[PDB]
PDB file of all heavy atoms in Angstrom:
ATOM      1  N   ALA J   1     -13.707   3.854  -7.193  1.00  0.00           N
ATOM      2  CA  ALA J   1     -14.065   2.934  -6.113  1.00  0.00           C
ATOM      3  C   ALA J   1     -12.823   2.173  -5.662  1.00  0.00           C
ATOM      4  O   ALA J   1     -12.697   1.966  -4.461  1.00  0.00           O
ATOM      5  CB  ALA J   1     -15.192   1.940  -6.537  1.00  0.00           C
ATOM      6  N   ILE J   2     -12.053   1.732  -6.572  1.00  0.00           N
ATOM      7  CA  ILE J   2     -10.812   0.994  -6.188  1.00  0.00           C
ATOM      8  C   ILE J   2      -9.859   1.956  -5.490  1.00  0.00           C
ATOM      9  O   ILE J   2      -9.306   1.602  -4.479  1.00  0.00           O
ATOM     10  CB  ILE J   2     -10.146   0.424  -7.446  1.00  0.00           C
ATOM     11  CG1 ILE J   2     -11.134  -0.704  -8.013  1.00  0.00           C
ATOM     12  CG2 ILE J   2      -8.795  -0.058  -7.176  1.00  0.00           C
ATOM     13  CD1 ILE J   2     -10.635  -1.195  -9.395  1.00  0.00           C
ATOM     14  N   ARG J   3      -9.725   3.131  -5.929  1.00  0.00           N
ATOM     15  CA  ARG J   3      -8.813   4.164  -5.372  1.00  0.00           C
ATOM     16  C   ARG J   3      -9.195   4.360  -3.857  1.00  0.00           C
ATOM     17  O   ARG J   3      -8.452   4.370  -2.962  1.00  0.00           O
ATOM     18  CB  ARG J   3      -8.888   5.492  -5.999  1.00  0.00           C
ATOM     19  CG  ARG J   3      -8.269   5.547  -7.417  1.00  0.00           C
ATOM     20  CD  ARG J   3      -8.406   6.926  -7.985  1.00  0.00           C
ATOM     21  NE  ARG J   3      -7.944   6.984  -9.397  1.00  0.00           N
ATOM     22  CZ  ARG J   3      -8.636   7.608 -10.337  1.00  0.00           C
ATOM     23  NH1 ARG J   3      -9.809   8.225 -10.060  1.00  0.00           N
ATOM     24  NH2 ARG J   3      -8.224   7.569 -11.592  1.00  0.00           N
ATOM     25  N   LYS J   4     -10.484   4.601  -3.691  1.00  0.00           N
ATOM     26  CA  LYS J   4     -11.017   4.889  -2.356  1.00  0.00           C
ATOM     27  C   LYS J   4     -10.789   3.705  -1.373  1.00  0.00           C
ATOM     28  O   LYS J   4     -10.443   3.977  -0.225  1.00  0.00           O
ATOM     29  CB  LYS J   4     -12.510   5.195  -2.430  1.00  0.00           C
ATOM     30  CG  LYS J   4     -12.782   6.552  -3.020  1.00  0.00           C
ATOM     31  CD  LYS J   4     -14.324   6.826  -3.096  1.00  0.00           C
ATOM     32  CE  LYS J   4     -14.598   8.144  -3.824  1.00  0.00           C
ATOM     33  NZ  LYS J   4     -16.013   8.408  -3.962  1.00  0.00           N
ATOM     34  N   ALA J   5     -10.964   2.498  -1.815  1.00  0.00           N
ATOM     35  CA  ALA J   5     -10.711   1.349  -0.909  1.00  0.00           C
ATOM     36  C   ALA J   5      -9.281   1.286  -0.617  1.00  0.00           C
ATOM     37  O   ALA J   5      -8.907   1.050   0.589  1.00  0.00           O
ATOM     38  CB  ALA J   5     -11.192   0.121  -1.639  1.00  0.00           C
ATOM     39  N   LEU J   6      -8.424   1.492  -1.541  1.00  0.00           N
ATOM     40  CA  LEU J   6      -6.994   1.477  -1.286  1.00  0.00           C
ATOM     41  C   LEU J   6      -6.554   2.564  -0.342  1.00  0.00           C
ATOM     42  O   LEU J   6      -5.714   2.379   0.582  1.00  0.00           O
ATOM     43  CB  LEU J   6      -6.166   1.588  -2.611  1.00  0.00           C
ATOM     44  CG  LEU J   6      -6.133   0.283  -3.467  1.00  0.00           C
ATOM     45  CD1 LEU J   6      -5.696   0.628  -4.869  1.00  0.00           C
ATOM     46  CD2 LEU J   6      -5.300  -0.773  -2.811  1.00  0.00           C
ATOM     47  N   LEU J   7      -7.022   3.725  -0.488  1.00  0.00           N
ATOM     48  CA  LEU J   7      -6.680   4.865   0.305  1.00  0.00           C
ATOM     49  C   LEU J   7      -7.104   4.610   1.762  1.00  0.00           C
ATOM     50  O   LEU J   7      -6.433   4.898   2.715  1.00  0.00           O
ATOM     51  CB  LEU J   7      -7.295   6.225  -0.198  1.00  0.00           C
ATOM     52  CG  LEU J   7      -6.619   6.718  -1.380  1.00  0.00           C
ATOM     53  CD1 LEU J   7      -7.524   7.737  -2.117  1.00  0.00           C
ATOM     54  CD2 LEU J   7      -5.186   7.288  -1.064  1.00  0.00           C
ATOM     55  N   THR J   8      -8.312   4.089   1.955  1.00  0.00           N
ATOM     56  CA  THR J   8      -8.900   3.794   3.282  1.00  0.00           C
ATOM     57  C   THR J   8      -8.044   2.674   3.951  1.00  0.00           C
ATOM     58  O   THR J   8      -7.720   2.808   5.138  1.00  0.00           O
ATOM     59  CB  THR J   8     -10.354   3.361   3.164  1.00  0.00           C
ATOM     60  OG1 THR J   8     -11.131   4.526   2.822  1.00  0.00           O
ATOM     61  CG2 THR J   8     -10.815   2.769   4.458  1.00  0.00           C
ATOM     62  N   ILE J   9      -7.711   1.722   3.253  1.00  0.00           N
ATOM     63  CA  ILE J   9      -6.860   0.615   3.773  1.00  0.00           C
ATOM     64  C   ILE J   9      -5.569   1.175   4.271  1.00  0.00           C
ATOM     65  O   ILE J   9      -5.026   0.856   5.301  1.00  0.00           O
ATOM     66  CB  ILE J   9      -6.658  -0.558   2.763  1.00  0.00           C
ATOM     67  CG1 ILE J   9      -8.014  -1.296   2.608  1.00  0.00           C
ATOM     68  CG2 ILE J   9      -5.622  -1.527   3.327  1.00  0.00           C
ATOM     69  CD1 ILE J   9      -7.995  -2.359   1.539  1.00  0.00           C
ATOM     70  N   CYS J  10      -4.918   2.030   3.428  1.00  0.00           N
ATOM     71  CA  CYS J  10      -3.607   2.585   3.721  1.00  0.00           C
ATOM     72  C   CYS J  10      -3.697   3.651   4.862  1.00  0.00           C
ATOM     73  O   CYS J  10      -2.763   4.036   5.466  1.00  0.00           O
ATOM     74  CB  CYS J  10      -3.000   3.207   2.539  1.00  0.00           C
ATOM     75  SG  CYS J  10      -2.411   1.978   1.376  1.00  0.00           S
ATOM     76  N   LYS J  11      -4.935   4.110   5.175  1.00  0.00           N
ATOM     77  CA  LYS J  11      -5.120   5.089   6.266  1.00  0.00           C
ATOM     78  C   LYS J  11      -5.061   4.292   7.609  1.00  0.00           C
ATOM     79  O   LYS J  11      -4.373   4.669   8.530  1.00  0.00           O
ATOM     80  CB  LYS J  11      -6.467   5.741   6.145  1.00  0.00           C
ATOM     81  CG  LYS J  11      -6.825   6.690   7.230  1.00  0.00           C
ATOM     82  CD  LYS J  11      -8.121   7.387   6.903  1.00  0.00           C
ATOM     83  CE  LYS J  11      -8.705   8.289   8.032  1.00  0.00           C
ATOM     84  NZ  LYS J  11      -9.324   7.417   9.133  1.00  0.00           N
ATOM     85  N   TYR J  12      -5.674   3.116   7.661  1.00  0.00           N
ATOM     86  CA  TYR J  12      -5.645   2.271   8.816  1.00  0.00           C
ATOM     87  C   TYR J  12      -4.392   1.485   8.987  1.00  0.00           C
ATOM     88  O   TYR J  12      -4.027   1.170  10.130  1.00  0.00           O
ATOM     89  CB  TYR J  12      -6.916   1.350   8.789  1.00  0.00           C
ATOM     90  CG  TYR J  12      -8.143   2.094   9.032  1.00  0.00           C
ATOM     91  CD1 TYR J  12      -8.949   2.520   7.929  1.00  0.00           C
ATOM     92  CD2 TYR J  12      -8.598   2.500  10.313  1.00  0.00           C
ATOM     93  CE1 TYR J  12     -10.082   3.393   8.194  1.00  0.00           C
ATOM     94  CE2 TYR J  12      -9.657   3.205  10.564  1.00  0.00           C
ATOM     95  CZ  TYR J  12     -10.407   3.679   9.506  1.00  0.00           C
ATOM     96  OH  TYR J  12     -11.558   4.458   9.717  1.00  0.00           O
ATOM     97  N   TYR J  13      -3.778   1.125   7.851  1.00  0.00           N
ATOM     98  CA  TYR J  13      -2.526   0.407   7.850  1.00  0.00           C
ATOM     99  C   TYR J  13      -1.546   1.149   7.001  1.00  0.00           C
ATOM    100  O   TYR J  13      -1.367   0.894   5.783  1.00  0.00           O
ATOM    101  CB  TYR J  13      -2.725  -1.010   7.343  1.00  0.00           C
ATOM    102  CG  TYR J  13      -3.429  -1.935   8.287  1.00  0.00           C
ATOM    103  CD1 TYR J  13      -4.706  -2.250   8.235  1.00  0.00           C
ATOM    104  CD2 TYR J  13      -2.652  -2.482   9.270  1.00  0.00           C
ATOM    105  CE1 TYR J  13      -5.295  -3.120   9.160  1.00  0.00           C
ATOM    106  CE2 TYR J  13      -3.158  -3.330  10.253  1.00  0.00           C
ATOM    107  CZ  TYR J  13      -4.488  -3.650  10.194  1.00  0.00           C
ATOM    108  OH  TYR J  13      -5.063  -4.449  11.096  1.00  0.00           O
ATOM    109  N   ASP J  14      -0.910   2.143   7.637  1.00  0.00           N
ATOM    110  CA  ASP J  14       0.062   2.977   6.934  1.00  0.00           C
ATOM    111  C   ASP J  14       1.318   2.187   6.454  1.00  0.00           C
ATOM    112  O   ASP J  14       2.010   1.667   7.269  1.00  0.00           O
ATOM    113  CB  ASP J  14       0.557   4.041   7.946  1.00  0.00           C
ATOM    114  CG  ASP J  14       1.579   5.037   7.503  1.00  0.00           C
ATOM    115  OD1 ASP J  14       1.709   5.067   6.201  1.00  0.00           O
ATOM    116  OD2 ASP J  14       2.142   5.747   8.278  1.00  0.00           O
ATOM    117  N   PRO J  15       1.473   2.160   5.141  1.00  0.00           N
ATOM    118  CA  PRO J  15       2.649   1.376   4.608  1.00  0.00           C
ATOM    119  C   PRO J  15       3.921   1.878   5.145  1.00  0.00           C
ATOM    120  O   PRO J  15       4.865   1.174   5.249  1.00  0.00           O
ATOM    121  CB  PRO J  15       2.459   1.581   3.032  1.00  0.00           C
ATOM    122  CG  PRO J  15       1.005   1.809   2.920  1.00  0.00           C
ATOM    123  CD  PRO J  15       0.629   2.675   4.059  1.00  0.00           C
ATOM    124  N   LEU J  16       4.017   3.149   5.432  1.00  0.00           N
ATOM    125  CA  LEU J  16       5.216   3.874   5.930  1.00  0.00           C
ATOM    126  C   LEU J  16       5.302   3.891   7.405  1.00  0.00           C
ATOM    127  O   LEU J  16       6.124   4.517   7.990  1.00  0.00           O
ATOM    128  CB  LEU J  16       5.218   5.266   5.395  1.00  0.00           C
ATOM    129  CG  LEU J  16       5.040   5.439   3.858  1.00  0.00           C
ATOM    130  CD1 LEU J  16       5.008   6.917   3.493  1.00  0.00           C
ATOM    131  CD2 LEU J  16       6.174   4.723   3.159  1.00  0.00           C
ATOM    132  N   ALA J  17       4.457   3.057   8.120  1.00  0.00           N
ATOM    133  CA  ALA J  17       4.442   3.017   9.561  1.00  0.00           C
ATOM    134  C   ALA J  17       5.886   2.825  10.042  1.00  0.00           C
ATOM    135  O   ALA J  17       6.600   1.886   9.649  1.00  0.00           O
ATOM    136  CB  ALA J  17       3.557   1.846  10.002  1.00  0.00           C
ATOM    137  N   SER J  18       6.276   3.647  11.031  1.00  0.00           N
ATOM    138  CA  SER J  18       7.669   3.564  11.618  1.00  0.00           C
ATOM    139  C   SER J  18       7.822   2.173  12.279  1.00  0.00           C
ATOM    140  O   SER J  18       9.068   1.749  12.466  1.00  0.00           O
ATOM    141  CB  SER J  18       7.775   4.686  12.621  1.00  0.00           C
ATOM    142  OG  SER J  18       6.934   4.627  13.677  1.00  0.00           O
ATOM    143  N   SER J  19       6.789   1.568  12.773  1.00  0.00           N
ATOM    144  CA  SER J  19       6.884   0.294  13.399  1.00  0.00           C
ATOM    145  C   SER J  19       7.466  -0.801  12.367  1.00  0.00           C
ATOM    146  O   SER J  19       8.022  -1.801  12.870  1.00  0.00           O
ATOM    147  CB  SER J  19       5.508  -0.240  13.847  1.00  0.00           C
ATOM    148  OG  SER J  19       4.687  -0.480  12.708  1.00  0.00           O
ATOM    149  N   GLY J  20       7.291  -0.531  11.097  1.00  0.00           N
ATOM    150  CA  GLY J  20       7.783  -1.478  10.044  1.00  0.00           C
ATOM    151  C   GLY J  20       6.768  -2.572   9.828  1.00  0.00           C
ATOM    152  O   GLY J  20       6.999  -3.373   9.018  1.00  0.00           O
ATOM    153  N   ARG J  21       5.783  -2.573  10.569  1.00  0.00           N
ATOM    154  CA  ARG J  21       4.710  -3.637  10.474  1.00  0.00           C
ATOM    155  C   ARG J  21       4.081  -3.804   9.101  1.00  0.00           C
ATOM    156  O   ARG J  21       3.615  -4.857   8.697  1.00  0.00           O
ATOM    157  CB  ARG J  21       3.613  -3.396  11.552  1.00  0.00           C
ATOM    158  CG  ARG J  21       4.029  -3.610  12.988  1.00  0.00           C
ATOM    159  CD  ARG J  21       2.779  -3.523  13.912  1.00  0.00           C
ATOM    160  NE  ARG J  21       1.776  -4.512  13.607  1.00  0.00           N
ATOM    161  CZ  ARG J  21       0.533  -4.394  13.870  1.00  0.00           C
ATOM    162  NH1 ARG J  21       0.063  -3.298  14.538  1.00  0.00           N
ATOM    163  NH2 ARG J  21      -0.359  -5.353  13.534  1.00  0.00           N
ATOM    164  N   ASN J  22       4.080  -2.648   8.399  1.00  0.00           N
ATOM    165  CA  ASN J  22       3.385  -2.654   7.042  1.00  0.00           C
ATOM    166  C   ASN J  22       4.330  -2.562   5.775  1.00  0.00           C
ATOM    167  O   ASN J  22       3.925  -2.135   4.773  1.00  0.00           O
ATOM    168  CB  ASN J  22       2.331  -1.571   7.012  1.00  0.00           C
ATOM    169  CG  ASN J  22       1.311  -1.670   8.131  1.00  0.00           C
ATOM    170  OD1 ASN J  22       0.853  -2.796   8.428  1.00  0.00           O
ATOM    171  ND2 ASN J  22       1.007  -0.583   8.792  1.00  0.00           N
ATOM    172  N   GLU J  23       5.538  -2.934   5.984  1.00  0.00           N
ATOM    173  CA  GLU J  23       6.549  -2.795   4.976  1.00  0.00           C
ATOM    174  C   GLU J  23       6.150  -3.808   3.867  1.00  0.00           C
ATOM    175  O   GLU J  23       6.546  -3.605   2.708  1.00  0.00           O
ATOM    176  CB  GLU J  23       7.971  -3.120   5.459  1.00  0.00           C
ATOM    177  CG  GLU J  23       8.563  -1.953   6.272  1.00  0.00           C
ATOM    178  CD  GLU J  23       9.924  -2.156   6.759  1.00  0.00           C
ATOM    179  OE1 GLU J  23      10.738  -2.950   6.166  1.00  0.00           O
ATOM    180  OE2 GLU J  23      10.308  -1.678   7.836  1.00  0.00           O
ATOM    181  N   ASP J  24       5.445  -4.868   4.208  1.00  0.00           N
ATOM    182  CA  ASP J  24       4.998  -5.812   3.278  1.00  0.00           C
ATOM    183  C   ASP J  24       4.083  -5.143   2.231  1.00  0.00           C
ATOM    184  O   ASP J  24       4.095  -5.358   1.016  1.00  0.00           O
ATOM    185  CB  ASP J  24       4.259  -7.036   3.933  1.00  0.00           C
ATOM    186  CG  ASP J  24       2.958  -6.575   4.576  1.00  0.00           C
ATOM    187  OD1 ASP J  24       2.898  -5.648   5.385  1.00  0.00           O
ATOM    188  OD2 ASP J  24       1.908  -7.285   4.383  1.00  0.00           O
ATOM    189  N   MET J  25       3.143  -4.301   2.774  1.00  0.00           N
ATOM    190  CA  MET J  25       2.317  -3.497   1.908  1.00  0.00           C
ATOM    191  C   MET J  25       3.059  -2.477   1.135  1.00  0.00           C
ATOM    192  O   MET J  25       2.772  -2.235  -0.097  1.00  0.00           O
ATOM    193  CB  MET J  25       1.211  -2.826   2.795  1.00  0.00           C
ATOM    194  CG  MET J  25       0.237  -3.745   3.508  1.00  0.00           C
ATOM    195  SD  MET J  25      -0.872  -2.900   4.791  1.00  0.00           S
ATOM    196  CE  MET J  25      -1.856  -1.720   3.551  1.00  0.00           C
ATOM    197  N   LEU J  26       4.073  -1.883   1.702  1.00  0.00           N
ATOM    198  CA  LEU J  26       4.902  -0.911   1.039  1.00  0.00           C
ATOM    199  C   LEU J  26       5.619  -1.555  -0.150  1.00  0.00           C
ATOM    200  O   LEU J  26       5.573  -1.021  -1.208  1.00  0.00           O
ATOM    201  CB  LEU J  26       5.901  -0.401   2.010  1.00  0.00           C
ATOM    202  CG  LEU J  26       6.975   0.628   1.412  1.00  0.00           C
ATOM    203  CD1 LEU J  26       6.265   1.769   0.770  1.00  0.00           C
ATOM    204  CD2 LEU J  26       7.888   1.125   2.524  1.00  0.00           C
ATOM    205  N   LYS J  27       6.089  -2.772   0.070  1.00  0.00           N
ATOM    206  CA  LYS J  27       6.795  -3.403  -1.016  1.00  0.00           C
ATOM    207  C   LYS J  27       5.876  -3.846  -2.154  1.00  0.00           C
ATOM    208  O   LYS J  27       6.273  -3.775  -3.284  1.00  0.00           O
ATOM    209  CB  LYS J  27       7.491  -4.737  -0.469  1.00  0.00           C
ATOM    210  CG  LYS J  27       8.531  -4.432   0.573  1.00  0.00           C
ATOM    211  CD  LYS J  27       9.327  -5.685   0.991  1.00  0.00           C
ATOM    212  CE  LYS J  27       9.982  -5.451   2.305  1.00  0.00           C
ATOM    213  NZ  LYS J  27       8.924  -5.524   3.352  1.00  0.00           N
ATOM    214  N   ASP J  28       4.706  -4.166  -1.777  1.00  0.00           N
ATOM    215  CA  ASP J  28       3.620  -4.445  -2.832  1.00  0.00           C
ATOM    216  C   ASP J  28       3.326  -3.246  -3.655  1.00  0.00           C
ATOM    217  O   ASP J  28       3.250  -3.400  -4.903  1.00  0.00           O
ATOM    218  CB  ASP J  28       2.306  -4.897  -2.039  1.00  0.00           C
ATOM    219  CG  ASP J  28       1.393  -5.723  -2.928  1.00  0.00           C
ATOM    220  OD1 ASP J  28       1.654  -5.797  -4.176  1.00  0.00           O
ATOM    221  OD2 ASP J  28       0.480  -6.368  -2.481  1.00  0.00           O
ATOM    222  N   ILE J  29       3.240  -2.111  -3.004  1.00  0.00           N
ATOM    223  CA  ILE J  29       2.943  -0.905  -3.764  1.00  0.00           C
ATOM    224  C   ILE J  29       4.118  -0.515  -4.655  1.00  0.00           C
ATOM    225  O   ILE J  29       3.946  -0.229  -5.824  1.00  0.00           O
ATOM    226  CB  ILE J  29       2.690   0.295  -2.756  1.00  0.00           C
ATOM    227  CG1 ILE J  29       1.404   0.010  -1.978  1.00  0.00           C
ATOM    228  CG2 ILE J  29       2.603   1.592  -3.525  1.00  0.00           C
ATOM    229  CD1 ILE J  29       1.226   0.977  -0.855  1.00  0.00           C
ATOM    230  N   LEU J  30       5.340  -0.576  -4.097  1.00  0.00           N
ATOM    231  CA  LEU J  30       6.530  -0.291  -4.847  1.00  0.00           C
ATOM    232  C   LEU J  30       6.659  -1.217  -6.107  1.00  0.00           C
ATOM    233  O   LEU J  30       7.031  -0.833  -7.164  1.00  0.00           O
ATOM    234  CB  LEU J  30       7.797  -0.387  -3.944  1.00  0.00           C
ATOM    235  CG  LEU J  30       7.877   0.673  -2.859  1.00  0.00           C
ATOM    236  CD1 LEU J  30       9.156   0.407  -2.000  1.00  0.00           C
ATOM    237  CD2 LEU J  30       7.905   2.003  -3.500  1.00  0.00           C
ATOM    238  N   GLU J  31       6.344  -2.433  -5.884  1.00  0.00           N
ATOM    239  CA  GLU J  31       6.449  -3.527  -7.007  1.00  0.00           C
ATOM    240  C   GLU J  31       5.393  -3.067  -8.083  1.00  0.00           C
ATOM    241  O   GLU J  31       5.696  -3.201  -9.246  1.00  0.00           O
ATOM    242  CB  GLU J  31       6.127  -4.845  -6.522  1.00  0.00           C
ATOM    243  CG  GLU J  31       7.200  -5.408  -5.636  1.00  0.00           C
ATOM    244  CD  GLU J  31       7.053  -6.919  -5.320  1.00  0.00           C
ATOM    245  OE1 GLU J  31       6.003  -7.256  -4.766  1.00  0.00           O
ATOM    246  OE2 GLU J  31       7.932  -7.713  -5.661  1.00  0.00           O
ATOM    247  N   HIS J  32       4.167  -2.586  -7.716  1.00  0.00           N
ATOM    248  CA  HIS J  32       3.173  -2.198  -8.710  1.00  0.00           C
ATOM    249  C   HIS J  32       3.612  -0.901  -9.355  1.00  0.00           C
ATOM    250  O   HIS J  32       3.090  -0.627 -10.493  1.00  0.00           O
ATOM    251  CB  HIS J  32       1.840  -2.116  -8.001  1.00  0.00           C
ATOM    252  CG  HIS J  32       1.091  -3.371  -7.814  1.00  0.00           C
ATOM    253  ND1 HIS J  32       1.480  -4.276  -6.839  1.00  0.00           N
ATOM    254  CD2 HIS J  32       0.078  -3.980  -8.517  1.00  0.00           C
ATOM    255  CE1 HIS J  32       0.683  -5.359  -6.908  1.00  0.00           C
ATOM    256  NE2 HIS J  32      -0.197  -5.176  -7.871  1.00  0.00           N
ATOM    257  N   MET J  33       4.510  -0.161  -8.709  1.00  0.00           N
ATOM    258  CA  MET J  33       4.938   1.098  -9.316  1.00  0.00           C
ATOM    259  C   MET J  33       5.948   0.746 -10.501  1.00  0.00           C
ATOM    260  O   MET J  33       6.296   1.642 -11.269  1.00  0.00           O
ATOM    261  CB  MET J  33       5.605   1.971  -8.325  1.00  0.00           C
ATOM    262  CG  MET J  33       4.566   2.673  -7.409  1.00  0.00           C
ATOM    263  SD  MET J  33       5.274   3.596  -5.863  1.00  0.00           S
ATOM    264  CE  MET J  33       6.468   4.784  -6.803  1.00  0.00           C
ATOM    265  N   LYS J  34       6.238  -0.520 -10.578  1.00  0.00           N
ATOM    266  CA  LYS J  34       7.127  -0.939 -11.628  1.00  0.00           C
ATOM    267  C   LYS J  34       6.415  -1.909 -12.590  1.00  0.00           C
ATOM    268  O   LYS J  34       7.008  -2.550 -13.527  1.00  0.00           O
ATOM    269  CB  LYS J  34       8.393  -1.688 -11.095  1.00  0.00           C
ATOM    270  CG  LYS J  34       9.202  -0.914 -10.059  1.00  0.00           C
ATOM    271  CD  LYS J  34      10.418  -1.720  -9.501  1.00  0.00           C
ATOM    272  CE  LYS J  34      11.406  -2.089 -10.656  1.00  0.00           C
ATOM    273  NZ  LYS J  34      12.499  -2.871 -10.051  1.00  0.00           N
ATOM    274  N   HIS J  35       5.126  -2.007 -12.464  1.00  0.00           N
ATOM    275  CA  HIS J  35       4.316  -2.866 -13.276  1.00  0.00           C
ATOM    276  C   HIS J  35       4.383  -2.568 -14.779  1.00  0.00           C
ATOM    277  O   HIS J  35       4.615  -1.357 -15.137  1.00  0.00           O
ATOM    278  CB  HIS J  35       2.863  -2.837 -12.880  1.00  0.00           C
ATOM    279  CG  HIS J  35       2.061  -4.017 -13.338  1.00  0.00           C
ATOM    280  ND1 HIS J  35       1.738  -5.074 -12.482  1.00  0.00           N
ATOM    281  CD2 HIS J  35       1.430  -4.222 -14.500  1.00  0.00           C
ATOM    282  CE1 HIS J  35       1.004  -5.904 -13.197  1.00  0.00           C
ATOM    283  NE2 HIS J  35       0.771  -5.412 -14.349  1.00  0.00           N
ATOM    284  N   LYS J  36       4.273  -3.538 -15.607  1.00  0.00           N
ATOM    285  CA  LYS J  36       4.389  -3.316 -17.073  1.00  0.00           C
ATOM    286  C   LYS J  36       3.169  -2.485 -17.594  1.00  0.00           C
ATOM    287  O   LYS J  36       3.274  -1.853 -18.531  1.00  0.00           O
ATOM    288  CB  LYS J  36       4.354  -4.694 -17.801  1.00  0.00           C
ATOM    289  CG  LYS J  36       3.172  -5.536 -17.615  1.00  0.00           C
ATOM    290  CD  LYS J  36       3.234  -6.916 -18.327  1.00  0.00           C
ATOM    291  CE  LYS J  36       2.058  -7.714 -18.174  1.00  0.00           C
ATOM    292  NZ  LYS J  36       2.177  -9.108 -18.909  1.00  0.00           N
ATOM    293  N   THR J  37       2.021  -2.635 -16.857  1.00  0.00           N
ATOM    294  CA  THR J  37       0.878  -1.871 -17.304  1.00  0.00           C
ATOM    295  C   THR J  37       0.898  -0.482 -16.811  1.00  0.00           C
ATOM    296  O   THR J  37       0.975  -0.186 -15.638  1.00  0.00           O
ATOM    297  CB  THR J  37      -0.422  -2.507 -16.727  1.00  0.00           C
ATOM    298  OG1 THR J  37      -0.496  -3.917 -17.156  1.00  0.00           O
ATOM    299  CG2 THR J  37      -1.609  -1.818 -17.137  1.00  0.00           C
TER     300      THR J  37
END
């Protein structure tokens, strides 16, 4: 359920958007990719 919500949000707000508007989300994802868990 969590995966689906995240995928949907990223569909409407593409973290990789060329506009750069969603780089904040991209950074959040990248930071979690380095999480201790």
Side-chain angles (χ1 to χ4, degrees):
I2 291 170
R3 290 181 188 133
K4 291 179 181 176
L6 284 167
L7 287 164
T8 288
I9 290 173
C10 288
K11 175 172 173 288
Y12 288 97
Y13 282 102
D14 178 15
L16 307 175
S18 61
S19 67
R21 293 183 61 203
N22 305 314
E23 285 180 32
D24 65 309
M25 292 171 67
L26 175 56
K27 301 189 199 68
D28 199 349
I29 296 173
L30 293 178
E31 290 190 300
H32 279 75
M33 283 171 57
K34 300 179 65 178
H35 199 97
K36 63 181 181 181
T37 302

